[PDB]
Amino acid sequence: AKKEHVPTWLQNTHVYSWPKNKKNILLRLLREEEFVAPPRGPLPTLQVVPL
Amino acid sequence: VREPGSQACLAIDPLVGEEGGAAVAKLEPHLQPRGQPAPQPLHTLVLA
């Protein structure tokens, strides 16, 4: 196949290639994100230093 | 002739408030260190 073969309305999503992206396809089917962000921390505490 | 005694010129000098002036302050954010056990992105792999 080639990029041109994808119907237009399907080009607005993730297009996997076979067998290149098989692991990514499995992740998509599992509905598990390949990267999961670390939990968001608290805003840093600002230290005031005179000059 | 006239004498400047009464009409003498005046010098001027401001009453500077620098002795009691506040200083300029620099801010530094206390970064949540990665040296401490900060979290990491969970890059996932699949065992097929």
Short mmCIF file of N, CA, C and O in Angstrom, two decimals:
data_model
loop_
_atom_site.label_atom_id
_atom_site.label_comp_id
_atom_site.label_asym_id
_atom_site.label_seq_id
_atom_site.Cartn_x
_atom_site.Cartn_y
_atom_site.Cartn_z
N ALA A 1 0.82 -1.20 0.00
CA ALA A 1 0.00 0.00 0.00
C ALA A 1 0.86 1.26 0.00
O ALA A 1 2.09 1.21 -0.02
N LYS A 2 0.19 2.41 0.03
CA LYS A 2 0.83 3.71 0.07
C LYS A 2 -0.10 4.69 0.76
O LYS A 2 -1.29 4.44 0.91
N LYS A 3 0.46 5.83 1.17
CA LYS A 3 -0.33 6.83 1.87
C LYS A 3 -1.53 7.26 1.05
O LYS A 3 -2.59 7.59 1.62
N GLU A 4 -1.40 7.29 -0.27
CA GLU A 4 -2.49 7.75 -1.12
C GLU A 4 -3.69 6.83 -1.05
O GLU A 4 -4.81 7.24 -1.36
N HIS A 5 -3.49 5.57 -0.66
CA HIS A 5 -4.58 4.60 -0.71
C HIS A 5 -5.55 4.77 0.45
O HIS A 5 -6.68 4.27 0.38
N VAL A 6 -5.14 5.45 1.51
CA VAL A 6 -6.01 5.64 2.67
C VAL A 6 -7.16 6.56 2.27
O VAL A 6 -6.91 7.66 1.76
N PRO A 7 -8.41 6.16 2.47
CA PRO A 7 -9.51 7.09 2.21
C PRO A 7 -9.36 8.35 3.05
O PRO A 7 -8.90 8.31 4.19
N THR A 8 -9.75 9.49 2.46
CA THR A 8 -9.43 10.78 3.07
C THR A 8 -9.90 10.85 4.51
O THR A 8 -9.13 11.26 5.40
N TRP A 9 -11.14 10.46 4.78
CA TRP A 9 -11.68 10.63 6.12
C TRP A 9 -10.92 9.79 7.14
O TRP A 9 -10.97 10.08 8.34
N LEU A 10 -10.21 8.76 6.69
CA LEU A 10 -9.43 7.94 7.61
C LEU A 10 -8.05 8.54 7.87
O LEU A 10 -7.35 8.10 8.78
N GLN A 11 -7.66 9.56 7.10
CA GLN A 11 -6.33 10.14 7.28
C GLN A 11 -6.29 11.09 8.48
O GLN A 11 -5.22 11.62 8.80
N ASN A 12 -7.42 11.31 9.14
CA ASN A 12 -7.46 12.20 10.29
C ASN A 12 -7.28 11.42 11.59
O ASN A 12 -7.78 11.84 12.64
N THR A 13 -6.59 10.29 11.54
CA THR A 13 -6.33 9.47 12.72
C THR A 13 -4.96 8.82 12.56
O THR A 13 -4.23 9.08 11.60
N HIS A 14 -4.61 7.97 13.53
CA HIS A 14 -3.35 7.25 13.46
C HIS A 14 -3.44 6.16 12.41
O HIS A 14 -4.32 5.30 12.46
N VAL A 15 -2.52 6.19 11.45
CA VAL A 15 -2.46 5.19 10.39
C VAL A 15 -1.24 4.32 10.64
O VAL A 15 -0.10 4.78 10.50
N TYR A 16 -1.47 3.07 10.99
CA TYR A 16 -0.40 2.13 11.25
C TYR A 16 -0.01 1.41 9.97
O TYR A 16 -0.77 1.36 9.00
N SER A 17 1.20 0.86 9.97
CA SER A 17 1.71 0.09 8.85
C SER A 17 2.01 -1.32 9.31
O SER A 17 2.39 -1.53 10.47
N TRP A 18 1.83 -2.29 8.42
CA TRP A 18 2.04 -3.68 8.75
C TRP A 18 3.18 -4.25 7.93
O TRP A 18 3.22 -4.01 6.72
N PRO A 19 4.11 -5.01 8.52
CA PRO A 19 4.24 -5.39 9.93
C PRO A 19 5.07 -4.41 10.74
O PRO A 19 5.50 -4.71 11.85
N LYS A 20 5.32 -3.21 10.21
CA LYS A 20 6.24 -2.29 10.86
C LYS A 20 5.74 -1.88 12.24
O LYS A 20 6.53 -1.82 13.20
N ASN A 21 4.45 -1.60 12.38
CA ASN A 21 3.90 -1.02 13.60
C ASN A 21 3.06 -2.02 14.40
O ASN A 21 2.15 -1.60 15.12
N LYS A 22 3.36 -3.31 14.31
CA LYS A 22 2.48 -4.30 14.92
C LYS A 22 2.36 -4.08 16.42
O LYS A 22 1.26 -4.20 16.99
N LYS A 23 3.46 -3.74 17.09
CA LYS A 23 3.39 -3.46 18.52
C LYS A 23 2.48 -2.27 18.80
O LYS A 23 1.70 -2.29 19.76
N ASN A 24 2.58 -1.23 17.97
CA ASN A 24 1.71 -0.07 18.16
C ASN A 24 0.25 -0.44 17.93
O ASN A 24 -0.64 0.06 18.63
N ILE A 25 -0.02 -1.32 16.96
CA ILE A 25 -1.39 -1.77 16.73
C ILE A 25 -1.91 -2.51 17.96
O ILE A 25 -3.06 -2.33 18.37
N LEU A 26 -1.07 -3.36 18.55
CA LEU A 26 -1.48 -4.06 19.76
C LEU A 26 -1.78 -3.08 20.88
O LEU A 26 -2.76 -3.23 21.62
N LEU A 27 -0.93 -2.06 21.04
CA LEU A 27 -1.19 -1.06 22.07
C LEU A 27 -2.51 -0.35 21.82
O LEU A 27 -3.29 -0.12 22.75
N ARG A 28 -2.79 -0.01 20.56
CA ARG A 28 -4.05 0.64 20.23
C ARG A 28 -5.24 -0.24 20.58
O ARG A 28 -6.23 0.22 21.15
N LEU A 29 -5.16 -1.53 20.24
CA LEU A 29 -6.26 -2.44 20.54
C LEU A 29 -6.43 -2.61 22.04
O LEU A 29 -7.56 -2.72 22.54
N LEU A 30 -5.32 -2.64 22.78
CA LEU A 30 -5.40 -2.75 24.23
C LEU A 30 -5.92 -1.46 24.86
O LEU A 30 -6.27 -1.45 26.04
N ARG A 31 -5.99 -0.38 24.09
CA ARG A 31 -6.38 0.92 24.61
C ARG A 31 -5.45 1.34 25.75
O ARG A 31 -5.87 1.91 26.76
N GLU A 32 -4.16 1.05 25.56
CA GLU A 32 -3.11 1.47 26.48
C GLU A 32 -2.18 2.42 25.74
O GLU A 32 -1.65 2.07 24.68
N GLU A 33 -1.98 3.60 26.30
CA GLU A 33 -1.10 4.58 25.66
C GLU A 33 0.35 4.13 25.76
O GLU A 33 0.80 3.65 26.81
N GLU A 34 1.09 4.29 24.67
CA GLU A 34 2.49 3.88 24.67
C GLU A 34 3.30 4.67 25.68
O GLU A 34 4.18 4.11 26.35
N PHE A 35 3.04 5.97 25.80
CA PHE A 35 3.66 6.81 26.82
C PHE A 35 2.58 7.23 27.80
O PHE A 35 1.54 7.76 27.40
N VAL A 36 2.82 6.99 29.09
CA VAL A 36 1.94 7.45 30.15
C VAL A 36 2.70 8.49 30.96
O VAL A 36 3.79 8.21 31.48
N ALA A 37 2.14 9.68 31.05
CA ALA A 37 2.83 10.79 31.69
C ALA A 37 3.00 10.52 33.18
O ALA A 37 2.13 9.90 33.81
N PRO A 38 4.10 10.96 33.78
CA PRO A 38 4.23 10.89 35.23
C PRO A 38 3.19 11.77 35.89
O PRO A 38 2.77 12.79 35.32
N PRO A 39 2.73 11.42 37.09
CA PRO A 39 1.69 12.23 37.73
C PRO A 39 2.14 13.68 37.88
O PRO A 39 3.30 13.96 38.18
N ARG A 40 1.20 14.60 37.65
CA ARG A 40 1.53 16.01 37.70
C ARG A 40 1.88 16.43 39.12
O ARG A 40 1.15 16.13 40.07
N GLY A 41 3.00 17.12 39.26
CA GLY A 41 3.47 17.56 40.55
C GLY A 41 2.84 18.86 40.98
O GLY A 41 1.91 19.37 40.34
N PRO A 42 3.32 19.43 42.08
CA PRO A 42 2.85 20.75 42.50
C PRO A 42 3.70 21.86 41.91
O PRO A 42 4.87 21.67 41.56
N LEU A 43 3.10 23.04 41.81
CA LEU A 43 3.84 24.18 41.31
C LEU A 43 5.05 24.45 42.20
O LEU A 43 4.96 24.37 43.43
N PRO A 44 6.20 24.78 41.61
CA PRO A 44 7.41 24.95 42.42
C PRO A 44 7.28 26.11 43.39
O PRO A 44 6.58 27.09 43.12
N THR A 45 7.96 25.99 44.52
CA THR A 45 7.99 27.08 45.49
C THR A 45 9.06 28.09 45.10
O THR A 45 10.22 27.74 44.87
N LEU A 46 8.66 29.36 45.04
CA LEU A 46 9.53 30.43 44.58
C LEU A 46 10.30 31.00 45.77
O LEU A 46 9.71 31.35 46.79
N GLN A 47 11.62 31.08 45.62
CA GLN A 47 12.49 31.61 46.65
C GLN A 47 12.93 33.01 46.27
O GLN A 47 13.38 33.25 45.15
N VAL A 48 12.80 33.94 47.21
CA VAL A 48 13.11 35.35 46.99
C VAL A 48 14.48 35.64 47.59
O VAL A 48 14.68 35.47 48.80
N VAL A 49 15.41 36.08 46.76
CA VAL A 49 16.79 36.34 47.16
C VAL A 49 17.08 37.81 46.88
O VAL A 49 16.92 38.25 45.74
N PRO A 50 17.51 38.60 47.86
CA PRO A 50 17.86 39.99 47.57
C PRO A 50 19.16 40.10 46.79
O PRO A 50 20.00 39.20 46.81
N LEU A 51 19.31 41.23 46.10
CA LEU A 51 20.55 41.53 45.39
C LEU A 51 21.22 42.75 46.02
O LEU A 51 22.43 42.94 45.88
N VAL B 1 28.02 100.48 46.69
CA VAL B 1 28.16 99.03 46.66
C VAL B 1 27.18 98.40 47.65
O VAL B 1 26.82 99.00 48.67
N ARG B 2 26.75 97.18 47.34
CA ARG B 2 25.87 96.40 48.20
C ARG B 2 26.58 95.11 48.59
O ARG B 2 27.50 94.66 47.89
N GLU B 3 26.16 94.51 49.70
CA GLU B 3 26.81 93.32 50.22
C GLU B 3 25.90 92.10 50.07
O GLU B 3 24.72 92.18 50.43
N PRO B 4 26.41 90.97 49.57
CA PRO B 4 25.54 89.79 49.40
C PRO B 4 25.11 89.13 50.69
O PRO B 4 24.39 88.13 50.64
N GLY B 5 25.53 89.65 51.85
CA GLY B 5 25.26 88.97 53.11
C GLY B 5 23.85 88.40 53.20
O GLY B 5 23.67 87.21 53.47
N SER B 6 22.85 89.25 52.99
CA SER B 6 21.46 88.80 53.12
C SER B 6 21.01 88.04 51.88
O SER B 6 20.19 87.12 51.97
N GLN B 7 21.54 88.41 50.71
CA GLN B 7 21.02 87.87 49.45
C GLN B 7 21.87 86.72 48.92
O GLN B 7 21.74 86.35 47.76
N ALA B 8 22.75 86.16 49.76
CA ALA B 8 23.70 85.14 49.31
C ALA B 8 23.02 84.04 48.51
O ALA B 8 21.84 83.73 48.73
N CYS B 9 23.75 83.43 47.57
CA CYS B 9 23.19 82.37 46.75
C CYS B 9 22.94 81.13 47.58
O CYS B 9 23.49 80.97 48.68
N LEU B 10 22.12 80.23 47.05
CA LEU B 10 21.75 79.00 47.72
C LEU B 10 22.24 77.80 46.93
O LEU B 10 21.99 77.69 45.72
N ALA B 11 22.93 76.89 47.61
CA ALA B 11 23.23 75.58 47.08
C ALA B 11 22.09 74.64 47.43
O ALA B 11 21.25 74.94 48.28
N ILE B 12 22.04 73.49 46.75
CA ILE B 12 20.97 72.52 46.94
C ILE B 12 21.57 71.13 47.04
O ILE B 12 22.60 70.83 46.42
N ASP B 13 20.92 70.27 47.82
CA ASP B 13 21.33 68.88 47.97
C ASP B 13 20.11 68.04 48.35
O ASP B 13 19.49 68.30 49.39
N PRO B 14 19.74 67.03 47.55
CA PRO B 14 18.54 66.26 47.88
C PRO B 14 18.71 65.49 49.18
O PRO B 14 19.82 65.14 49.57
N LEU B 15 17.59 65.23 49.85
CA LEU B 15 17.56 64.35 51.01
C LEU B 15 17.29 62.93 50.52
O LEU B 15 16.17 62.43 50.50
N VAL B 16 18.37 62.27 50.10
CA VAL B 16 18.25 60.95 49.49
C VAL B 16 17.71 59.95 50.51
O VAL B 16 18.13 59.93 51.68
N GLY B 17 16.77 59.11 50.06
CA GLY B 17 16.23 58.08 50.92
C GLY B 17 16.90 56.73 50.72
O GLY B 17 16.37 55.71 51.16
N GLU B 18 18.06 56.71 50.07
CA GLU B 18 18.72 55.44 49.77
C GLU B 18 19.05 54.66 51.04
O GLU B 18 19.00 53.43 51.03
N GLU B 19 19.40 55.36 52.12
CA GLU B 19 19.76 54.67 53.36
C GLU B 19 18.64 53.76 53.85
O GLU B 19 18.93 52.73 54.47
N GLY B 20 17.39 54.11 53.59
CA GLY B 20 16.25 53.28 53.96
C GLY B 20 15.55 52.62 52.80
O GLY B 20 14.37 52.26 52.94
N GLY B 21 16.20 52.46 51.66
CA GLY B 21 15.53 51.92 50.49
C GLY B 21 15.53 50.40 50.49
O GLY B 21 16.50 49.76 50.91
N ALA B 22 14.43 49.81 50.02
CA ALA B 22 14.36 48.37 49.87
C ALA B 22 15.20 47.92 48.68
O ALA B 22 15.45 48.69 47.75
N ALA B 23 15.64 46.66 48.72
CA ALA B 23 16.52 46.14 47.69
C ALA B 23 15.73 45.40 46.61
O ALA B 23 14.59 44.98 46.82
N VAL B 24 16.35 45.27 45.44
CA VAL B 24 15.77 44.47 44.37
C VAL B 24 15.97 43.00 44.67
O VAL B 24 17.06 42.57 45.08
N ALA B 25 14.92 42.21 44.47
CA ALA B 25 14.90 40.81 44.84
C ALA B 25 14.84 39.93 43.60
O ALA B 25 14.05 40.18 42.69
N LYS B 26 15.67 38.90 43.59
CA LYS B 26 15.69 37.92 42.51
C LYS B 26 14.91 36.68 42.94
O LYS B 26 15.06 36.21 44.07
N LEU B 27 14.10 36.16 42.04
CA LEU B 27 13.30 34.97 42.30
C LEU B 27 13.94 33.75 41.64
O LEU B 27 14.46 33.83 40.53
N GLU B 28 13.91 32.63 42.35
CA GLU B 28 14.36 31.35 41.82
C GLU B 28 13.30 30.31 42.15
O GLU B 28 12.93 30.16 43.33
N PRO B 29 12.79 29.57 41.17
CA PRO B 29 11.84 28.50 41.49
C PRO B 29 12.56 27.30 42.08
O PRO B 29 13.60 26.88 41.58
N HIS B 30 12.00 26.76 43.16
CA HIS B 30 12.56 25.56 43.76
C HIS B 30 12.16 24.35 42.92
O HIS B 30 11.10 23.75 43.14
N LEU B 31 13.00 23.99 41.95
CA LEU B 31 12.67 22.90 41.05
C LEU B 31 12.40 21.63 41.84
O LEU B 31 13.14 21.28 42.76
N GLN B 32 11.33 20.93 41.48
CA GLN B 32 11.13 19.59 42.02
C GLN B 32 12.24 18.71 41.47
O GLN B 32 12.20 18.32 40.30
N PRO B 33 13.26 18.38 42.27
CA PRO B 33 14.46 17.76 41.69
C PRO B 33 14.19 16.35 41.18
O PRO B 33 13.42 15.59 41.77
N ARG B 34 14.84 16.02 40.07
CA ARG B 34 14.93 14.63 39.64
C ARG B 34 16.01 13.86 40.39
O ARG B 34 15.99 12.63 40.39
N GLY B 35 16.94 14.57 41.04
CA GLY B 35 17.85 13.90 41.95
C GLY B 35 17.10 13.19 43.06
O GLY B 35 17.42 12.06 43.43
N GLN B 36 16.08 13.85 43.61
CA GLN B 36 15.12 13.16 44.46
C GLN B 36 14.25 12.25 43.60
O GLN B 36 14.15 12.43 42.38
N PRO B 37 13.61 11.25 44.20
CA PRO B 37 12.88 10.24 43.41
C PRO B 37 11.64 10.82 42.73
O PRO B 37 10.49 10.53 43.10
N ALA B 38 11.87 11.66 41.72
CA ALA B 38 10.77 12.20 40.94
C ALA B 38 10.26 11.15 39.96
O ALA B 38 11.00 10.24 39.57
N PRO B 39 9.00 11.26 39.53
CA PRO B 39 8.45 10.26 38.61
C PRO B 39 9.05 10.39 37.21
O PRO B 39 9.73 11.36 36.88
N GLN B 40 8.78 9.38 36.40
CA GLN B 40 9.31 9.27 35.04
C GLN B 40 8.19 8.87 34.09
O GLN B 40 7.16 8.33 34.52
N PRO B 41 8.35 9.14 32.80
CA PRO B 41 7.32 8.73 31.83
C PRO B 41 7.36 7.22 31.62
O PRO B 41 8.43 6.63 31.47
N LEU B 42 6.18 6.61 31.60
CA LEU B 42 6.07 5.15 31.55
C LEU B 42 6.02 4.67 30.10
O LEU B 42 5.00 4.18 29.61
N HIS B 43 7.14 4.81 29.41
CA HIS B 43 7.26 4.27 28.06
C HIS B 43 7.00 2.77 28.08
O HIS B 43 7.76 2.00 28.68
N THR B 44 5.93 2.35 27.41
CA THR B 44 5.42 0.99 27.51
C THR B 44 5.85 0.17 26.31
O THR B 44 5.95 0.70 25.20
N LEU B 45 6.12 -1.11 26.54
CA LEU B 45 6.41 -2.07 25.50
C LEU B 45 5.49 -3.27 25.66
O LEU B 45 4.90 -3.48 26.73
N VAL B 46 5.35 -4.05 24.60
CA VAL B 46 4.42 -5.17 24.55
C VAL B 46 5.20 -6.46 24.36
O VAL B 46 6.04 -6.56 23.46
N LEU B 47 4.92 -7.44 25.21
CA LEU B 47 5.49 -8.78 25.09
C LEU B 47 4.46 -9.64 24.37
O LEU B 47 3.44 -10.03 24.95
N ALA B 48 4.72 -9.92 23.10
CA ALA B 48 3.72 -10.54 22.23
C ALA B 48 3.78 -12.06 22.24
O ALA B 48 2.75 -12.72 22.38
#
